[PDB]
Amino acid sequence: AQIVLGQIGPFTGPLAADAAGLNQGIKAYLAQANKAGGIRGQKLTLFEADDRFSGEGFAEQFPKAMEKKPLALISPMGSAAIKRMLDDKLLDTAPVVVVNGVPGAESLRTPGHPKFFHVRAGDKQEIEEIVSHAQMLGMSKLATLYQDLPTGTSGMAVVQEAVKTVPGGKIELNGVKSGPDAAALAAAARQIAALGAQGVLVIGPPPFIVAGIAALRKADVTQPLFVLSYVSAAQIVKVVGVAGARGVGIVQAFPDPNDKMLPVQREFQAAMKEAFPQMQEYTEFQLEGYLSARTVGEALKHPKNTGLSAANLAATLSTMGEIDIGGFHLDFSKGNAGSRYVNIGVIGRDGQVYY
Template identity: 30%
Template sequence: MARAWVRDGLQGASRISFPLHSIRSKERKMRNGILIKLLLPVAALLCGVQPGWAEDILIGHVSGYTGPVSKDANDLHLGAKIFFDNVNEKGGYEGRKFRIVTADDKYNPAETLRLVGAMIGKASALLPTTGSAGLLSVIKSGILDRASLPIVGAVPSPISSRVLQRNIFHFRAGDRDQITALTRQLVTVGYRDICIVMSENPFGLQAGDLAEKALAGHGAKADCKPIFKIAPSTDFSGVIAALKSHPQQAIIVFAPPKAVVETVVAIRQAGVRSPVYTLSYTDHQMLIDALGQRNAAGIGIVQVMPNLNKTILPLIRSFQDDYEKFGGTTQPPTYFNLEGYVSARLIYEAIRKSKDASAEGVRRGLEQMQNIDLGGFLLSFSPDNHTGSRFVDLSVITSSGRLIY
């Protein structure tokens, strides 16, 4: 049929003179082009991709959406989402929308490594990771030494992850900064006998070692240093026995947020009333929900982000506005929501800085962001410095369930 059509066309166009094989070649190209256009949507659906998504700027989030840090992962995601929702509503970046692609590593370091590797070449950046072991597995593998995929934030931030890495950018004060500030404060108020409770993971053990050395430098001691293993039903009997056999003026707990809450519950149920302190990774609302306002009152939490209630700060005001508009929840915002929000904003500002939405563009843009003010939160990056902030403050839960700084 096609050949007859070509012949008939030529008979009616005798003034045109060019070879028949040229017409057949053009006919094949036209037919193939039509076929490709028809099959593209089908192929996209088979691959799980919807038309138009190829133009989206993909932002990855590899985190423990199930397991002991699930709340942190979801809070970080929501914080980033509300920022990108606001940007997308205003047209995105040069007409391209931002889309977050999540991957659940189940708090398993091997899965973290595999999923981060799968994001290379696809995502322009990664939102904060959760879990020290997972981040360290990525660093030790070297996969990000050979590619461009900036990780913008890490929770927690053990000292071993703070060595300059090409693709890792920290915007929260690290464990060393937090522990230095906390131990200094405890010694200043007169505490000398302090118990350090640690989970048996890289973060807990490294934090415990840092705290012990910091206390010794102030003339204080930590003779009580119980370690516990995180499990679906954690056994705290060893922790309780150590606390009761070593009189202490204060207790510092180093563990993932959910484990911190479980530890404090076990301590209080055992009748141990010493003041408890922990780092910025634990949400104060989790402690209040588990203990009640009365029993949670007085617990100290190191903070590395601006006060959520300080709406005089432009950053907090815009965060609160976007949370109310795009959050889709009646739950109050958390500090991990704010961290996700800041991570997303840094990614966006890096793209604007470099004028390049690729992973390398984000990485390069971040290194160009020196002495920037996000609206009451100051950061500074450079090719030789990937730790943007060392801001640290100490907060205490009040009897009304609020945090005071």
């Protein structure tokens, strides 16, 4: 017998590279887990299904995935997909747990679903942290560039609430909505350039963040730009160079995938060398996939756990209390959001992220 896990992800379309990154991290953990004898006498296996970055694609793949009797679906990715999962109430009678979701939009997390567990900190806490940070940089005027998508609008509403309740005092906030196309972004960037803002938040799916940064730099917005946990510094440098990337702050939901400070960083890196030896550098999505899968592994191996069903897994996640995964802590005792870790990195003049 085997322990089946599933990943439904946007493997084709504009998030293909990031979905591949999550998948790499998940496989890296599973291989490490299997080398260590799997769990309770059983090997871990992963099946994959492509939702094509659409709600329709997710709706189509979900029952096909459920036919394989997975214990867990690991880190679905895509606003439309997760929204469809919640709107269609797919989880209400499905014997499965969903571990992690990207993005951590407040609208997907609240109310969320009792079978839907979150490993990354939410967009709301990341945005509150960004607004606090902006104040410590002496900023009194902030602009936000956001994609015209439900989760983007959710982000924008969160920014508005964060700014009106930051304890340092009044910040003037302007929010500029944009379509995802190059022409729309150039126009949005020109508007932002005219505002005299001291910093700019960019909110949206990963390709929108990269495109938005490039558009802002091209519009001569040289001010600090801030982004949430959805892009790597490498992706930013690829497009705008070290010149354009320096000064971008990235809010991280996990320890840096390329630093070696914590046991979990070293274990992740060891798992990646084994599974993908050609890889010279890692991303946050690889680490997210690794930690999402490892959360399932640690719950199933936990002394409290008594079996290998979805019900066992859910029972254990909610009752095991705080666990320490090599320095990264998770606790689902108080609710389904397991992490409050948020750490802002800034891309330095040398192209490296500093914390």
